[PDB]
């Protein structure tokens, strides 16, 4: 229908990291193969005098096949030649929680209501993704606008993703 390789993405033109600061609300995600964060998740992002973007992150996790539990996680991000993608080095405050390094996309976001995260985990040959998770962010728990909600709606059809999130809760669980 449209053109689904992560190399066509359009991410945040001139991403603000400073802007970006602050506490994001995740209000829907798109899981990847082995989903991590459950829900709850809110994130916590910063930057430092250097300009490195860095977050920190709670929510609910999931540890084992059966249940899960609250969990601290820690993500610092590497710059690259574009403003809006990045390489995030994550882990939990806990050293069994999961550890890893993901391309970490700021897709889109008006810095003050929301955000569009997107990362590609695993290419496919034909560039299309092949295991991708993607996060939408609210300043608000309780919500995106109107328009920014249609707005986030486009953005997720852009990375092929619209069918496949699904709402992240925020009940005090953590």
Request: aromatic fraction near 18%; charge should be positive.
């Given at each position: 229908e449209?053109?689904?390789?992560?190399?066509?993405?359009?991410?945040?033109?001139?991403?603000?990291?400073?802007?970006?600061?602050?506490?994001?609300y995740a209000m829907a995600k798109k899981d990847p193969e082995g989903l991590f964060l459950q829900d709850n998740i809110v994130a916590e992002f910063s930057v430092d005098e250097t300009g490195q973007m860095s977050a920190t992150a709670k929510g609910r996790v999931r540890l084992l096949n059966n249940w899960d539990v609250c969990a601290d996680m820690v993500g610092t991000f590497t710059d690259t030649e574009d403003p809006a993608k990045?390489?995030?080095?994550?882990?939990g405050v806990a050293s069994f929680l999961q550890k890893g390094n993901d391309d970490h996309w700021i897709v889109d976001t008006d810095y003050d209501t929301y955000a569009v995260q997107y990362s590609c985990r695993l290419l496919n040959l034909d560039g299309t993704c092949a295991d991708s998770?993607?996060?939408?962010?609210?300043?608000?728990?309780?919500?995106?606008?109107?328009?920014?909600?249609?707005?986030?709606?486009?953005?997720?059809?852009?990375?092929?993703?619209?069918?496949?999130?699904?709402?992240?809760?925020?009940?005090?669980?953590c």
């Open positions: 449209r053109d689904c390789r992560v190399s066509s993405f359009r991410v945040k033109e001139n991403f603000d990291k400073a802007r970006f600061s602050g506490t994001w990045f390489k995030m080095k994550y882990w998770y993607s996060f939408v962010f609210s300043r608000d728990p309780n919500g995106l606008p109107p328009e920014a909600q249609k707005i986030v709606r486009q953005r997720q059809e852009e990375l092929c993703l619209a069918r496949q999130y699904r709402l992240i809760v925020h009940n005090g669980y």
